[PDB]
Amino acid sequence: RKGHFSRCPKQYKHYCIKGRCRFVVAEQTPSCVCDEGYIGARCERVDLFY
Numbered sequence: 173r174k175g176h177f178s179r180c181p182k183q184y185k186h187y188c189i190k191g192r193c194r195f196v197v198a199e200q201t202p203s204c205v206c207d208e209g210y211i212g213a214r215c216e217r218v219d220l221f222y
Contacts, residue, residue: 180204191215 180193187193191206211217 177201187214189215190218 175194177194177196180195185191185193185204188204188206189212190210191204193202193204195202206215207218209218209220211219
């Protein structure tokens with residue numbers, strides 16, 4: 173319909189520091205989306221101060 177999946181909790185977000193992730197249980201699809209204004213491979217740096 174719109175987005176009925178499982179949101180990744182901060183406790184399990186070790187693959188992304190400043191990035192969220194949507195894990196689909198019914199259809200096994202683990203996808204991590206980092207902040208658009210972020211920088212670094214592990215989402216450590218950022219491109220937005222104010």
